Amino acid sequence: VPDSIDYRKKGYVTPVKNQGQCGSCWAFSSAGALEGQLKKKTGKLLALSPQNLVDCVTENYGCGGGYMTTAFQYVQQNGGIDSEDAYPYVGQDESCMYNATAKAAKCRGYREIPVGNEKALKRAVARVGPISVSIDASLASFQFYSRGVYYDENCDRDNVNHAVLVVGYGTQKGSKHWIIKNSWGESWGNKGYALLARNKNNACGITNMASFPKM
Amino acid sequence: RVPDSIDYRKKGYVTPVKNQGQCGSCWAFSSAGALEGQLKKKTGKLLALSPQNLVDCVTENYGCGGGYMTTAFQYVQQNGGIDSEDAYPYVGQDESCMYNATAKAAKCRGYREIPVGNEKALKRAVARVGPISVSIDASLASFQFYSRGVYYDENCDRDNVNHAVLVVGYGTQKGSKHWIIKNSWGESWGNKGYALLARNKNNACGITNMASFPKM
Amino acid sequence: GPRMLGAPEEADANEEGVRRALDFAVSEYNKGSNDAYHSRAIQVVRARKQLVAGVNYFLDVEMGRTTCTKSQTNLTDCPFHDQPHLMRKALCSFQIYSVPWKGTHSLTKFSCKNA
Amino acid sequence: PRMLGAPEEADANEEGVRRALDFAVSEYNKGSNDAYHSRAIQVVRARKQLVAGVNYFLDVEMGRTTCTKSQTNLTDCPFHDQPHLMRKALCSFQIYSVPWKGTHSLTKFSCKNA
Numbered sequence A: 001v002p003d004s005i006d007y008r009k010k011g012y013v014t015p016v017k018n019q020g021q022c023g024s025c026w027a028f029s030s031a032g033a034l035e036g037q038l039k040k041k042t043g044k045l046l047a048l049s050p051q052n053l054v055d056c057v058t059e060n061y062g063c064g065g066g067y068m069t070t071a072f073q074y075v076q077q078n079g080g081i082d083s084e085d086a087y088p089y090v091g092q093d094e095s096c097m098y099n100a101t102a103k104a105a106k107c108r109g110y111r112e113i114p115v116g117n118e119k120a121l122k123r124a125v126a127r128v129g130p131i132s133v134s135i136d137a138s139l140a141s142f143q144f145y146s147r148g149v150y151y152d153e154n155c156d157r158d159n160v161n162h163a164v165l166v167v168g169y170g171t172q173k174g175s176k177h178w179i180i181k182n183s184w185g186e187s188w189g190n191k192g193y194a195l196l197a198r199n200k201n202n203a204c205g206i207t208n209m210a211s212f213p214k215m
Numbered sequence B: 001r002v003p004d005s006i007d008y009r010k011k012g013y014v015t016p017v018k019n020q021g022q023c024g025s026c027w028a029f030s031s032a033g034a035l036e037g038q039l040k041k042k043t044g045k046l047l048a049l050s051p052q053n054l055v056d057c058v059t060e061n062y063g064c065g066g067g068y069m070t071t072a073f074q075y076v077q078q079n080g081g082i083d084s085e086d087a088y089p090y091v092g093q094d095e096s097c098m099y100n101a102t103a104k105a106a107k108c109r110g111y112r113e114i115p116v117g118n119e120k121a122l123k124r125a126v127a128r129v130g131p132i133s134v135s136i137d138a139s140l141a142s143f144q145f146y147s148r149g150v151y152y153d154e155n156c157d158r159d160n161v162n163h164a165v166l167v168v169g170y171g172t173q174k175g176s177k178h179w180i181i182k183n184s185w186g187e188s189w190g191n192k193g194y195a196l197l198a199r200n201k202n203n204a205c206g207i208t209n210m211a212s213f214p215k216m
Numbered sequence C: 001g002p003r004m005l006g007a008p009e010e011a012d013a014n015e016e017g018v019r020r021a022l023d024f025a026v027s028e029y030n031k032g033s034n035d036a037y038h039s040r041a042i043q044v045v046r047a048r049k050q051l052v053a054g055v056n057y058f059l060d061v062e063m064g065r066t067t068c069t070k071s072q073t074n075l076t077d078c079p080f081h082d083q084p085h086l087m088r089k090a091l092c093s094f095q096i097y098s099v100p101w102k103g104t105h106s107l108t109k110f111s112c113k114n115a
Numbered sequence D: 001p002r003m004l005g006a007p008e009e010a011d012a013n014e015e016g017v018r019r020a021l022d023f024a025v026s027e028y029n030k031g032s033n034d035a036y037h038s039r040a041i042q043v044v045r046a047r048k049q050l051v052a053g054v055n056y057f058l059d060v061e062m063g064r065t066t067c068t069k070s071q072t073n074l075t076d077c078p079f080h081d082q083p084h085l086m087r088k089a090l091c092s093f094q095i096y097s098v099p100w101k102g103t104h105s106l107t108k109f110s111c112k113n114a
């Protein structure tokens, strides 16, 4: 468990995308976690289809929201998930179009991060890879984020509301941080990425609902 | 509580038969074949991997002058991957390691070996894992001129194997249990490149004498 | 229990984002009305918000015709019309997509009826 | 254990090796430009390798014989007398055999003097 680590440098993270007007953050977060485990087990970085998950994860509500745990259950029970290329993202609800012959990744289950334990998340991020996490992204200070390590006293560390992807952790100008990838386009934040406060008492509830898939 | 018959060709786990030619690279076709099947299982895509990668680069083997499968599996683990047949096409001749880093097509996290002489074990391994690299006695003429049926020969040396093939299933044919094996001797050998070897008949041809598969 | 991520939720109509989505709806409403008089909001019957790449606002609002004209300058006081044939009512559904860091508002679904 | 596809020493009396030696003799005469038939005295080292078929690595001592290059009584053809008329040679062959195709193929060969 090193003190610095950035899975973008290692070639584990696909380019930042934009979920648009669709409540599909859970699909992007879970897809990026699968993209990470596909890289670790295969060596190929292949963008996967969040649209696949939005349309076909019947226990979630598509653009009406969902959980990352259910997305992994889908890929497990369904026996695969298509690539972004074979099943591109459209930012809207539609009928399931899962193409089994074009599947690009499977999933043997998921393991949840213990609630509240940032050491455990750090441990998981170090041995596993990019981890899907839930945060409270509702504050304006998070919408207008630009630089530095984000910390805001008013961040609801009990009720989280948005999925992102932890692609590493480190330190910047003295403060420890998480490295999170968002799905709000490169025009948000820092080219689509942000730094969230680490070990500042579960800032924004980042460990309240974190998960990763097993391949 | 394990299936009576399985055929990984139907499941989309097996690439088409190849011909190793004059090069003695059966071990590389077998290992690459077990890795092909195990990549299909983990990810879902079937991609033919490069036996020439292994012939050239497994320096602890002798390239076209022979080798082991477990060694090939250990190379891809420590080397950190193996290229695909398209990126590293087969030539059937020794050459320098042209392994291409960024063209990683599959990875390997070790290997495991079948208990020697335990066909019951090999049966479970084929069912659970997938296609298993195995070693047989393929030196007899009866095997060279095999064409159909369940191969059995009382002279098949079940103590000293000499050739690597790839088990891709098992079952029964006319009431004789058998193993399904993919050879590396082209489609004009055997039954479009495959054969049925006698199963549960006292380790016929030493099939479980040196069987292994990779971990991903 | 713990809500779902990205799901719509009820919104307080006094937020600095709901008010701004409302003033946007009114502005596009007046531009989409053949009515001479400028129209303004009476009440918000329902306000829902949804977190996405930005925010979706789902506003069910009661609109009303005022006495002041569509193109007055000091459009800061505009009382509702008194006489029965001076006044008019409507219940409107707006879906507004806001991107705060781009400073944009967008009307994506719209539907008014009498009320 | 033993490596798979590794060449190994072989007995020159084996059916496969005798068949490979005859092919080497025929190809040896086919491209010699000689007067008399020239067969093998003995095999001094034989190795076989298992592949898509069988590779044979043969070291043989050759020598010119009494019989002419084109006569059909090739069954009983002894060797010439003096070293001047014998032209002894130690040949090293390399034969790719594919039994289920009926194929024999001479990949490599050379001959020093003995």
Ligand SMILES: *[C@@H]1O[C@H](CO)[C@@H](O[C@@H]2O[C@H](CO)[C@@H](O)[C@H](O)[C@H]2NC(C)=O)[C@H](O)[C@H]1NC(C)=O
Binding pocket: A086, A099, A100, A101, A102
């Ligand atoms: C599911 O995806 C596969 C893979 O992309 C599609 O297979 C294509 O089939 C056509 C002929 O039907 C070929 O010309 C293409 O080359 C195939 N694709 C590839 C990538 O090789 C298949 O058509 C898709 N099925 C659907 C969408 O129903």
Ligand SMILES: *[C@@H]1O[C@H](CO)[C@@H](O[C@@H]2O[C@H](CO)[C@@H](O)[C@H](O)[C@H]2NC(C)=O)[C@H](O)[C@H]1NC(C)=O
Binding pocket: B087, B100, B101, B102, B103
């Ligand atoms: C080894 O792999 C590298 C991959 O980096 C190959 O370089 C690529 O070549 C293709 C063919 O035009 C390009 O489309 C890629 O853009 C190249 N890579 C990068 C990073 O740009 C290289 O050709 C391979 N070597 C071989 C096959 O001998």
